[PDB]
Write a protein that binds this ligand. Structure first.
Ligand SMILES: [Mg+2]
Ligand SMILES: [Mg+2]
Ligand SMILES: [Mg+2]
Ligand SMILES: [Mg+2]
Ligand SMILES: [Mg+2]
Ligand SMILES: [Mg+2]
Ligand SMILES: [Mg+2]
Ligand SMILES: [Mg+2]
Ligand SMILES: [Mg+2]
Ligand SMILES: [Mg+2]
Ligand SMILES: [Mg+2]
Ligand SMILES: [Mg+2]
Ligand SMILES: [Mg+2]
Length: 262
RNA sequence: AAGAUUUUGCAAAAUUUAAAUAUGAUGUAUAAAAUCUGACACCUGCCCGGUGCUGCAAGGUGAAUCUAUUUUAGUUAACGCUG
């Protein structure tokens, strides 16, 4: 879960920085794993609809309990695995009934740690006195806390903070009407209910922000192809195309203005 | 590769079609789309008059429809109908 500063034995390893993907601690399974068709920015009729997208050597799917309401036993963590699209880690979880699943892990966890889901107040977890990375109801939480994968009361799935190093800070708590006012990563505010649910602690890989690819072939092997300027392009192909590289206004090929107030 | 600006808070914006839909993505602002420059180091200065873009209280110009008011023509023996 740490950065690697490489010694400049090549041009591309001079600035590169990447995370230890922890292959020794990834016991791979065939229970949660599918590999679907790679969608290269196309529809079913073959036509490109979103550009700059292609082959992905790291295509997979791993089914996850974003919602951990269905069991309350205590658990451990046997192993780990990595996700690419959000650059987040996960970890298996073995419940005391020998059950199994994957979960979103929080920052500060690792093999050997414990985790559970909580129906009742905090004093009634005699196991698992530490509380990080646990599925909990927002009312049954401290004054100060931060949530990372939120499931609203009027909803099945989670729609906020699912990316790396994110959270949802609390601004207020209104237990009267059971209505919380949480902050998003941007800064906007949203009404949520304390009957809703979420995880505790920021999601894994806080340190993706301190990354440098250093090689074009690290994106090509994800499904990120080569972009092209609208200025090298011919006037047929793009509304900037031509010999002049200056342009009032600054536009998009389907026709609309990108830069506003500008 | 890297840097900056602009849009998008989730049945997301953008994209495809006449439409259902397809899709972005079973991804959630450390994400997605567009745009100009182009490793790294030092720097990236003054000006919002002009054009362009965005926004727009009050004010000015501003279409039909509804309503009210005013003015007026033709025709009929008459009431009246109509414009
Ligand atoms: Mg096309
Ligand atoms: Mg792109
Ligand atoms: Mg380019
Ligand atoms: Mg040319
Ligand atoms: Mg043409
Ligand atoms: Mg043209
Ligand atoms: Mg020239
Ligand atoms: Mg540079
Ligand atoms: Mg420019
Ligand atoms: Mg001005
Ligand atoms: Mg204007
Ligand atoms: Mg106006
Ligand atoms: Mg006005």
């Amino acid at each position: 879960m740490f950065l690697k500063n490489y010694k400049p034995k090549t041009p591309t390893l001079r600035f590169k920085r990447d995370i230890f993907k922890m292959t020794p601690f990834i016991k791979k399974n065939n229970i949660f794993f599918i590999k679907n068709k790679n969608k290269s920015g196309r529809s079913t009729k073959g036509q490109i609809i979103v550009r700059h997208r292609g082959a992905n050597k790291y295509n997979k799917h791993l089914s996850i309990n974003v919602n951990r309401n269905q069991l309350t036993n205590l658990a451990i963590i046997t192993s780990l695995n990595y996700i690419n699209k959000n650059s987040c880690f996960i970890g298996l979880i073995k419940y005391s009934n020998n059950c199994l699943s994957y979960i979103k892990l929080a920052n500060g966890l690792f093999i050997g740690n414990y985790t559970k889901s909580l129906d009742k107040p905090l004093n009634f977890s005699f196991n698992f006195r530490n509380i990080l990375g646990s599925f909990i109801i927002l009312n049954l939480a401290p004054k100060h806390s931060i949530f990372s994968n939120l499931i609203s009361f009027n909803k099945k799935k989670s729609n906020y903070a699912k990316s790396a190093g994110t959270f949802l800070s609390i601004i207020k708590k209104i237990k009267e009407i059971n209505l919380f006012i949480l902050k998003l990563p941007t800064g906007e505010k949203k009404y949520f209910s304390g009957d809703s649910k979420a995880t505790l602690g920021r999601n894994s890989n806080f340190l993706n922000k301190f990354t440098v690819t250093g090689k074009a072939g690290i994106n090509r092997n994800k499904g990120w192809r080569s972009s092209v300027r609208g200025v090298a392009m011919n006037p047929v192909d793009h509304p900037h195309g031509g010999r002049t590289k200056t342009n009032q206004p600054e536009m998009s090929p389907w026709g609309w203005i990108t830069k506003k107030n500008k």
